[PDB]
Swiss-Prot record, chain A:
The chain holds residues 63 to 159 of 244 of the full protein. Component of the Mediator complex, a coactivator involved in the regulated transcription of nearly all RNA polymerase II-dependent genes. Mediator functions as a bridge to convey information from gene-specific regulatory proteins to the basal RNA polymerase II transcription machinery. Mediator is recruited to promoters by direct interactions with regulatory proteins and serves as a scaffold for the assembly of a functional preinitiation complex with RNA polymerase II and the general transcription factors. It comes from Homo sapiens. Belongs to the Mediator complex subunit 19 family. This is Mediator of RNA polymerase II transcription subunit 19. It is found in: Nucleus.
UniProtKB/Swiss-Prot annotation, chain C:
Belongs to the Mediator complex subunit 14 family. This is Mediator of RNA polymerase II transcription subunit 14. The lineage of its organism: Eukaryota, Metazoa, Chordata, Craniata, Vertebrata. The chain holds residues 50 to 146 of 1454 of the full protein. It is found in: Nucleus. Interacts with GATA1. Component of the Mediator complex, which is composed of MED1, MED4, MED6, MED7, MED8, MED9, MED10, MED11, MED12, MED13, MED13L, MED14, MED15, MED16, MED17, MED18, MED19, MED20, MED21, MED22, MED23, MED24, MED25, MED26, MED27, MED29, MED30, MED31, CCNC, CDK8 and CDC2L6/CDK11. The MED12, MED13, CCNC and CDK8 subunits form a distinct module termed the CDK8 module. Mediator containing the CDK8 module is less active than Mediator lacking this module in supporting transcriptional activation. Component of the Mediator complex, a coactivator involved in the regulated transcription of nearly all RNA polymerase II-dependent genes. Mediator functions as a bridge to convey information from gene-specific regulatory proteins to the basal RNA polymerase II transcription machinery. Mediator is recruited to promoters by direct interactions with regulatory proteins and serves as a scaffold for the assembly of a functional preinitiation complex with RNA polymerase II and the general transcription factors. It comes from Homo sapiens (Human).
UniProtKB/Swiss-Prot annotation, chain D:
The lineage of its organism: Eukaryota, Metazoa, Chordata, Craniata, Vertebrata. Component of the Mediator complex, which is composed of MED1, MED4, MED6, MED7, MED8, MED9, MED10, MED11, MED12, MED13, MED13L, MED14, MED15, MED16, MED17, MED18, MED19, MED20, MED21, MED22, MED23, MED24, MED25, MED26, MED27, MED29, MED30, MED31, CCNC, CDK8 and CDC2L6/CDK11. The MED12, MED13, CCNC and CDK8 subunits form a distinct module termed the CDK8 module. Mediator containing the CDK8 module is less active than Mediator lacking this module in supporting transcriptional activation. Constitutively sumoylated. Component of the Mediator complex, a coactivator involved in the regulated transcription of nearly all RNA polymerase II-dependent genes. Mediator functions as a bridge to convey information from gene-specific regulatory proteins to the basal RNA polymerase II transcription machinery. Mediator is recruited to promoters by direct interactions with regulatory proteins and serves as a scaffold for the assembly of a functional preinitiation complex with RNA polymerase II and the general transcription factors. Belongs to the Mediator complex subunit 7 family. This is Mediator of RNA polymerase II transcription subunit 7. It is found in: Nucleus. Disulfide bonds: none annotated. It comes from Homo sapiens.
UniProtKB/Swiss-Prot annotation, chain F:
Belongs to the Mediator complex subunit 21 family. Interacts with PPARG. Component of the Mediator complex, which is composed of MED1, MED4, MED6, MED7, MED8, MED9, MED10, MED11, MED12, MED13, MED13L, MED14, MED15, MED16, MED17, MED18, MED19, MED20, MED21, MED22, MED23, MED24, MED25, MED26, MED27, MED29, MED30, MED31, CCNC, CDK8 and CDC2L6/CDK11. The MED12, MED13, CCNC and CDK8 subunits form a distinct module termed the CDK8 module. Mediator containing the CDK8 module is less active than Mediator lacking this module in supporting transcriptional activation. It is found in: Nucleus. Disulfide bonds: none annotated. Component of the Mediator complex, a coactivator involved in the regulated transcription of nearly all RNA polymerase II-dependent genes. Mediator functions as a bridge to convey information from gene-specific regulatory proteins to the basal RNA polymerase II transcription machinery. Mediator is recruited to promoters by direct interactions with regulatory proteins and serves as a scaffold for the assembly of a functional preinitiation complex with RNA polymerase II and the general transcription factors. It comes from Homo sapiens. This is Mediator of RNA polymerase II transcription subunit 21.
Length: 75, 128, 97, 58, 122, 36
């Protein structure tokens, strides 16, 4: 009569991919303000080094002499 | 206060009287907004969600003399492309409610604050 | 991690300032001002990069949320691939025997 | 088939109909499994469904 | 917070001291060194405050700001990839939906009896 | 072997094979961006 070893179907309200969780946690409005750097440096020309040296160093991370240096360095 | 007088020429003039845009004039840029004061500005922009016609301009001029002189070139720049955006939308079509003649001579009192003629010649050239 | 990076940058800037103060009298004063303005440019670069990092520090939560969203969608994606593999393996290997 | 394999068919043995019912049940379970992959493919109940059709194929 | 304000004051004091040392400092140039030392102390206090905060940052944003990338645009690609993968899995799910729709109607048209039986069963 | 029971086996095998191939082709290529 009844079907053999039939199992329980899962819940109706569960986590899926087709749902939009960005709208669920309210981050899509931030995306709306967002929708820069090279865009800002590209909008301007279109419409019309020490940084590389200091990158690894920041990636890893007397008064009388100063007065004499200040007095003599003006030349 | 310069941003307030920028909002005296942005929310009451560009959006033609929409209430919800003027109360969220700084709040629509939520991420480019002062988050500890957007709620404080929400208190004052809700009282001015409808536009209010401010007729006096010497109150700006009296408060400008106690202010840094960079801001008079700001407010002439803050009205230059602002009404250029108005007259282009007036040309394109949806701006059926222009900033009227009382607001027009309201601007006419403003550029004589320091006689910034050269920054206002080419603006008056492209207007005309 | 931003605290450790800020502390390490402060320690490095202090060590470099002490080394410059020790080597200021050794170097000629005309070149010493060049070294001092170069080191001041370095300290301004460190300060503005720490400023950019702490300007990012308020936006860490959105990055973490997007990473979690990506991990969830990848998890589901892997399962779909796995099911197909399970189907291919059961249809091509178990059946033949 | 009695030892080692769970039995869902009775002793009546409608051999052609056991052939078609097993073909029948597999196709609707494959559509059910596709719906399971549509709704929650990351569930725990997948391997129960996988071994059920494997039971059907034996 | 106050760490950002301390870092901004540190950068301002460093720029002012650099401009003063670049020019001929007539007054006490040790005030610039004192300002730099106060900037370092404020940076150390900000480091202690952040250690109390216990905030973590990954290193990829460091080479992004080495290029000069604003955090807002990094959040732009984060939200973009999240929404793009959401659209991809949604499209896959919808194609799966129409595929099983053709499955249901095909099983109905060729095999009406067992399809109706399963419709009764669900 | 080589009776009509055998060709039924490989027909349902290829039907399952051409399902994942059609799914595999539909997921490996398509319209890249249109807001083929």
């Amino acid at each position: 009569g009844p079907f053999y070893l039939m199992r329980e179907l899962p819940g109706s309200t569960e986590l899926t991919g087709s749902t939009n969780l960005i709208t669920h946690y309210n981050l899509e409005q931030a995306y709306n303000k967002f929708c820069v750097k090279e865009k800002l440096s590209n909008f301007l020309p279109d419409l019309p080094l020490r940084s590389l040296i200091e990158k690894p160093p920041i990636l890893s991370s007397g008064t009388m002499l100063a007065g004499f240096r200040l007095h003599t360095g003006p030349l | 206060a310069i941003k307030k007088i920028t909002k005296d020429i942005l929310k009451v003039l560009n959006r033609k009287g929409t209430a919800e845009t003027d109360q969220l004039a700084p709040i629509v840029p939520l991420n480019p907004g002062d988050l500890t004061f957007l709620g404080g500005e929400d208190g004052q922009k809700r009282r001015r969600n409808r536009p209010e016609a401010f007729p006096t301009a010497e109150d700006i001029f009296a408060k400008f003399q106690h202010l840094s002189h960079y801001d008079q070139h700001q407010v002439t720049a803050q009205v230059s492309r602002n009404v250029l955006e108005q007259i282009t939308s007036f040309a394109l079509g949806m701006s059926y409610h222009l900033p009227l003649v009382q607001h027009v001579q309201f601007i006419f009192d403003l550029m004589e604050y320091s006689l910034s003629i050269s920054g206002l010649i080419d603006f008056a050239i492209q207007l005309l | 991690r931003l605290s450790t990076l800020i502390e390490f940058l402060l320690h490095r800037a202090y060590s470099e300032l002490m080394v410059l103060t020790d080597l200021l009298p050794r170097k000629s004063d005309v070149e010493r001002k060049i070294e001092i303005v170069q080191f001041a440019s370095r300290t301004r670069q460190l300060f503005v990069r720490l400023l950019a990092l702490v300007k990012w520090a308020n936006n860490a939560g959105k990055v973490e949320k997007c990473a979690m969203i990506s991990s969830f969608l990848d998890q589901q994606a892997i399962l779909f691939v796995d099911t197909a593999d399970r189907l291919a393996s059961l249809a091509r290997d178990a059946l033949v025997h | 088939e009695s030892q080692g394999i769970e039995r869902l068919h009775p002793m009546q043995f409608d051999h052609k109909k056991e052939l078609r019912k097993l073909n029948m049940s597999i196709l609707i379970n494959f559509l059910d499994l596709l719906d399971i992959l549509i709704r929650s493919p990351g569930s725990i109940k997948r391997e129960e469904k996988l071994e059920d059709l494997k039971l059907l194929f034996v | 917070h106050l760490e950002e304000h301390l870092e901004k004051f540190v950068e301002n004091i460093r720029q002012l001291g650099i401009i003063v040392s670049d020019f001929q400092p007539s007054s006490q140039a040790g005030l610039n060194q004192k300002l730099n030392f106060i900037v370092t102390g404020l940076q150390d206090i900000d480091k202690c405050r952040q250690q109390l905060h216990d905030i973590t940052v990954p290193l990829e944003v460091f080479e992004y700001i080495d290029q000069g990338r604003n955090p807002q645009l990094y959040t732009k690609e984060c939200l973009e990839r999240a929404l793009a993968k959401n659209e991809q899995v949604k499209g896959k799910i919808d194609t799966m939906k129409k595929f099983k729709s053709l499955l249901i109607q095909e099983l109905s048209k060729v095999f009406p009896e067992d399809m109706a039986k399963y419709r009764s069963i669900r | 072997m080589a009776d009509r029971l055998t060709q039924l086996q490989d027909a349902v095998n290829s039907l399952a094979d051409q399902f994942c191939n059609a799914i595999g082709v539909l997921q490996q290529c398509g319209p890249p961006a249109s807001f083929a």
